[PDB]
Amino acid sequence: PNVSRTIARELKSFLLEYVYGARIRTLGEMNSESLEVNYRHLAESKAILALFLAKCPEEMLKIFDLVAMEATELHYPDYARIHSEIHVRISDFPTIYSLRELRESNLSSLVRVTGVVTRRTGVFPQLKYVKFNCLKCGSILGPFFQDSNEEIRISFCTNCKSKGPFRVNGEKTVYRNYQRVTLQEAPGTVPPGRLPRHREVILLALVDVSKPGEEVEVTGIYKIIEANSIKRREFSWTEEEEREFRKISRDRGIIDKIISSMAPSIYGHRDIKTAVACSLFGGVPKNVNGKHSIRGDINVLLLGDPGTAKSQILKYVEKTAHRAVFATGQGASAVGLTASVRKDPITKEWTLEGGAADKGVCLIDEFDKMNDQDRTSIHEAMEQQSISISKAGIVTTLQARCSIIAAANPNGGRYNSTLPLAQNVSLTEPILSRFDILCVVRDLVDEEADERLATFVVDSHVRSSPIPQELLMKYIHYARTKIYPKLHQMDMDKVSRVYADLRRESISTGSFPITVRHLESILRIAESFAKMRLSEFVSSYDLDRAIKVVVDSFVDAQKVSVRRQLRRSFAIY
């Protein structure tokens, strides 16, 4: 149509009257081909262009590249010798859709969707055109083939009129660059009972800038989604809820209220939920001059009798938290640590995908019942916050810095308290050393516990002071994405004095030692409590709760013969 000719000259006058000169000089000097245009800018200028981009973006994209190349040609001479075409990046889409709202009415239009990328393919062959060799007469014939069907069977020759066997000739054929990533819905925003959907995305002209296993925002057209723009930056906090969170965090020591708000179904005890809350709230990751990456996550390990609740609590924690997936699994396990390089049968190739939480928390149930692959993958992810892929022609180190909450059972049911935890569990010491907190429950008897536990669990079943659940789960996302509390060298050296007592007393009476990882763990627990307290820095008494958390985990993980250590730690209790 000639109506595009009055569209072209409109936006040609728009780019010289708005930041577009700085945008075109940055794409021209970086020899770049990506031009950035915000939707609000031209939408404030002309809403009819925004309506045309929302209705027919495929014919709207035939004007954009031409006027961008014309602006680059009169701004820079001979730019067509190196770069023939320059694309545009339509960002700032207001109506962000979900993957379950993708319907028949959203066809041939612009859509911004959130997701997680997996099984990414780079520069993998795509077909646009074909040819075919007819074997009977030995002739050539060719049509078209895009990116959705398998292939358009050709069975009728020109003059053979035969049903002979035909062969695929792609030795005169088109050149297609294909990078399709199977995007999935995030588990932190899926409704309960339903399953997350998945789609296939085409990436062209934007390959290997995306990270698998992370949240992503893609703006493209819907037909199979053909992505135009990618964004690796991304139930949220608002302005009306952020002032009341600081007002709630300033009054009445909210750490214990968050602990009491963690388990509404049962009474429990604070040793499981204190480790659970400090593991979900996490610490901060720090590096010195680009190296020495410390793990900011806290991996907790639960142990005890089978009757006691370990799965219900984990499930509740997962529901409460963002990007937390309860993978669990024993026999099912399959590919360990969600990271895998594998062949794919749809088009016969090699691909890499990190399964399903790079910032999230992964929940493992029945830790003692696994094979060699899923133990080694979680040992690599616990040793380092990354999983490397070094096969099928690809080498990629993906983020596996996810917190680990594992639950296990001992060999025989009973805890057998007259033996240490190393003889009790089947696991050894270096896989136990990655877990900083080892919480363990035991058995109990008198009327007191019978009067409280059964009444609280029957109160939880007869019904269909603490902090409410919605404000708590909004506070988790508000504190984990805005603050980073450091430490100041004013009086922190005193903990190096008390560690100097606490290390030495573990040799003379105990058998298992205390190392520098426990010091890193109590600094992470103290900064996690400072994160939950929403302070600027860690206080002096946060380390008191941190040393209490490490004493009732390490001393409780041993025999009854470390009983003198129950009173030896009473001076700092």
């Binding site: 009972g193 006691t308 669990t328 399964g355 149930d365 058995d443 029957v458």
Partner: protein
């Protein structure tokens, strides 16, 4: 011959849709609700209507339904054109889906012949596997070789078609038009696997499965591993496939009101749940209370709890404890039986599909039943992997499958009926249950009730048992006969299932003392307390009393004391 019959049946269908409005105030006279249904969907524009076949069977003395019922594929565009004309005249991007439901006859997968090709059919069964939704071409926009003219081509659900003549006489060629996707409406197309139910399989036969196609907005509703009932059209695929339009999650009052007003119902119910077994009232009590559960709903936080009853039978060799196993599966429709020794499969195994080399989760023993009893014979000869898969499926009422990078968990509700035997067979009273059962604590936990059966020489009941065995060995004896049949017992089980009762304060005050009395015998923790709490609403539903009194929970306390 149907070219002049199609316009007449289109006029009859639009007269059926035009002559029926809504006059349903004060439960008076009846008339169909279709015009208000179209007026309600006017805002949402989905056009995925539901028309009842029972409501269509009254016109022309059923003769309009019988003529449409055999020539459904030959009358379907006339029906959609009549629906299009009535929504074009009653109301001002256009796709349509007409769904029929509630057929009076339920047909199996083994009674499908070639005489019903093209007719409508009701197929019930269980879904084995599912295929991810893909766009259906439906209709495409072809462009000519020289005219560059648009042609709206309608596919016929067989294979990629192609026109023959250009409509504009600017050309008359037959060379390759080119396909176009802008002006071609696309509908999601899913292909799932339906299979024969476990209660209607012939003796020695194989449970033959079949693939059924589905379009419109009937997709993404059918959950895997759940008994389903489809209504559609038998369409051949170059194989005899099926097309469904309606999905549902499936799986007299004078007799029911007479049976809930008496007082001795429960005593005939404990001796009528297994009429072939002499003795063992406690095992019959647990089997009767293990069919119906309760109070699982939602915890005050947001997590679902284990509201089911787990039943496990143990004892010496050569008893009648497998007979219950043979009864449940012959009477309960939601019942899957496995041999146990010859068994991932239990916890829903993973199998690959070559289209995308993608995984699908087969239910197997663990997820086949919904609100039913999965019965595993020989529980102690199983491996460690399936028993930790059972434990992973039991801590939380869900099952997780981790394969090929994807992790998927789903809600499966089952009541495990575990038949076990000792390490030596003979049960010795010398030691505890743990050393004789020979299985670890966690897999020993989350079990509500254990039934230990010991035998010896006690002539007075033994002669009666042997006489009952030899009196049973005849052609359909009356000795076995129950006080009432299963005919009202099935609807009684369903009526007690949809009841949903609750506990009081006196029951909780007696329950805390009962938990102290159960813990005074000491393993016993919160799980056995949850098992007796779940058995309380099951015995409340079985006795059909809403607010529970502690006297009916006293029998459950005595049942726990008897074990």
């Amino acid at each position: 011959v149907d070219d002049v019959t199609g316009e007449k049946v289109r006029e009859a269908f639009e007269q059926f849709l035009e002559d029926f409005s809504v006059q349903s105030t004060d439960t008076g006279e009846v008339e169909k609700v279709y015009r208000a249904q179209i007026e309600f969907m006017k805002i949402y524009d989905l056009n995925t209507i539901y028309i009842d076949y029972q409501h269509l069977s009254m016109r022309e003395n059923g003769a309009l339904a019988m003529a449409i019922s055999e020539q459904y594929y030959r009358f379907l565009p006339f029906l959609q054109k009549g629906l299009r004309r009535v929504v074009r005249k009653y109301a001002p991007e256009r796709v349509f889906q007409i769904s029929f439901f509630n057929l009076p006859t339920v047909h199996r997968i083994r009674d499908i012949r070639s005489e019903k090709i093209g007719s409508l059919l009701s197929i019930s069964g269980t879904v084995t596997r599912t295929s991810e939704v893909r766009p259906e071409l439906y209709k495409a926009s072809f462009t000519c070789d020289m005219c560059r003219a648009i042609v709206d081509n309608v596919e016929q659900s067989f294979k990629y078609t192609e026109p023959t003549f250009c409509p504009n006489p600017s050309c008359e060629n037959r060379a390759f038009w080119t396909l176009n996707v802008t002006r071609s409406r696309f509908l999601d197309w899913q292909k799932v696997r339906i299979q024969e139910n476990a209660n209607e399989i012939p003796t020695g036969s194989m449970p033959r499965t079949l693939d059924v196609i589905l379009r419109g907005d009937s997709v993404e509703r059918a959950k895997p591993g759940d008994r389903c009932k489809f209504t559609g059209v038998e369409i051949v695929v170059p194989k005899i496939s099926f097309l469904a339009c309606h999905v549902i999650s499936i799986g007299e009052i004078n007799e029911l009101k007479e049976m809930v007003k008496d007082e001795h119902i429960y005593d005939k119910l404990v001796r009528s749940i297994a009429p072939a077994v002499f003795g063992h009232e406690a095992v019959k009590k647990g089997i009767l209370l293990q069919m119906l559960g309760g109070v699982h709903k939602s915890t005050v936080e947001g997590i679902k709890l284990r509201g089911d009853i787990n039943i496990c039978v143990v004892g010496d060799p050569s008893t009648s404890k497998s007979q219950f196993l043979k009864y449940v599966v012959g009477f309960a429709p939601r019942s899957v039986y496995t041999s146990g020794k010859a068994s991932a499969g239990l916890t829903a195994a993973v199998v690959r599909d070559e289209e995308g080399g993608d995984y699908t989760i087969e239910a197997g023993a663990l997820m086949l039943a919904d609100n039913g009893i999965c019965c595993i014979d020989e529980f102690d000869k199983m491996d460690i992997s399936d028993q930790v898969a059972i434990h992973e499926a039991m801590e939380q009422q869900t099952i997780s499958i981790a394969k090929a990078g994807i992790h998927a968990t789903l809600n499966a509700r089952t009541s495990i009926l575990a038949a076990a035997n000792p390490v030596g067979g003979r049960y010795n009273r010398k030691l505890s249950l743990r050393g004789n059962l020979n299985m670890t604590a966690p897999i020993m936990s989350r079990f509500d009730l254990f039934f230990v059966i010991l035998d010896d020489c006690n002539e007075k009941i033994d002669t009666e048992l042997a006489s009952h065995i030899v009196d049973l060995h005849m052609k359909r004896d009356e000795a076995i006969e129950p006080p009432f049949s299963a005919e009202q017992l099935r609807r009684y089980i369903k009526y007690a299932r949809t009841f949903k009762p609750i506990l009081t304060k006196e029951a909780r005050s007696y329950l805390v003392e009962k938990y102290k009395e159960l813990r005074k015998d000491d393993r016993i923790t919160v799980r056995q307390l949850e098992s007796m709490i779940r058995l309380s609403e099951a015995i409340a539903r079985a006795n059909c009393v809403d607010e529970i009194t502690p006297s009916f929970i006293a029998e459950a306390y005595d049942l726990l004391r008897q074990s």
